[PDB]
């Protein structure tokens, strides 16, 4: 299972990738 | 005639890592409520507080370089500072350099501001709700 | 990531970003809350009286352990237990060459062996001076725990009748070594001091000295 901090790290990493796909667009 | 409880205390002090046991000798339970590898130590926490003074709230990367030899979690840094100032979202303080003394006062004000509007949870003031 | 599974579309990305944001707030409070409970004296599942040491046994030099033990107990240990991480992987070689003999003078040793490492365990505990005396067996599927002996065990320290040579899984589908093992050691030695090598955080019982890279 994931811990709260691992989940948040995944979410933060995800957000960046998105924001950067919104960037590239 | 062996007193185990004393035995454990002695053994830990002379053999265990400093995170595992207190100078008291007793077992540091906080270390085992966290996954191995991910423990946040008291020397970690001052490092962070130093880094807000020197580099500012936003710049986790610069802090990671200087204070943690690159080995901290950038997200953990962000989260830890939220605690430091007692608010759930800190975009307000982004870029700012704050003093260890100021941070307490900032957080004290933020808990103050917080407790009142009734948006206060677990010692953090939730400016952002959802 | 993964790249494939994410939306490439603006509308997908915008709604994903919206949902990520709510989720971050959700897990933020869970983290702050968790972190706070810990600050205000929360208690771990670890028993009060155990000695956790996080180390690598290759690097570890036992002498400090030996000195500290002699210092606080006046005896070396009565029972040593090992679940080696066979080839997270240590070659047969560096597990084998551990200076175990320094560790105990008179008691029992217990070692876990998958069928492949079964023979290897025999001649590696013989090397450490032990005599093969017993094997516990665990059904879940089987794995052996081989038992050997050195020194004098004719003291009152070790009780002669052994509860079982069979052991059973605590829970269906389980892969951590069963608990009944700790009790059986309790049979063999009651309130003696024991050492475990290659320990895990779930492996900690009070009065036990546990050493491992993950503790």
TrEMBL record, chain A:
Coiled coil: none annotated. It comes from the Eukaryota. This is Myb-like domain-containing protein.
UniProtKB/TrEMBL annotation, chain B:
Keywords: Membrane, Transmembrane, Transmembrane helix. This is Transmembrane protein, putative. It comes from Tetrahymena thermophila (strain SB210). The chain holds residues 164 to 293 of 295 of the full protein.
Automatic annotation (TrEMBL), chain C:
The keyword Nucleotide-binding does not apply. GO terms for biological process: methylation. S-adenosyl-L-homocysteine 2 binds at residues 56-57, 177, 200, 202-203, 213-214. GO terms for cellular component: nucleus; RNA N6-methyladenosine methyltransferase complex. It comes from the Eukaryota. Keywords: Methyltransferase, S-adenosyl-L-methionine, Transferase. S-adenosyl-L-methionine 3 binds at residues 56-57, 214. GO terms for molecular function: mRNA m(6)A methyltransferase activity. S-adenosyl-L-homocysteine 4 binds at residues 203, 213. It catalyses: an adenosine in mRNA + S-adenosyl-L-methionine = an N(6)-methyladenosine in mRNA + S-adenosyl-L-homocysteine + H(+). S-adenosyl-L-homocysteine 3 binds at residues 56, 175, 213-214. The keyword Coiled coil does not apply. Its EC number is 2.1.1.348. S-adenosyl-L-methionine 1 binds at residues 56-57, 213-214. S-adenosyl-L-homocysteine 1 binds at residues 56-57, 177, 202-203, 213. It is an enzyme of class 2 (transferase). S-adenosyl-L-methionine 2 binds at residues 56-57, 177, 200, 202-203, 213-214. Belongs to the MT-A70-like family. This is mRNA m(6)A methyltransferase. The chain holds residues 183 to 428 of 428 of the full protein.
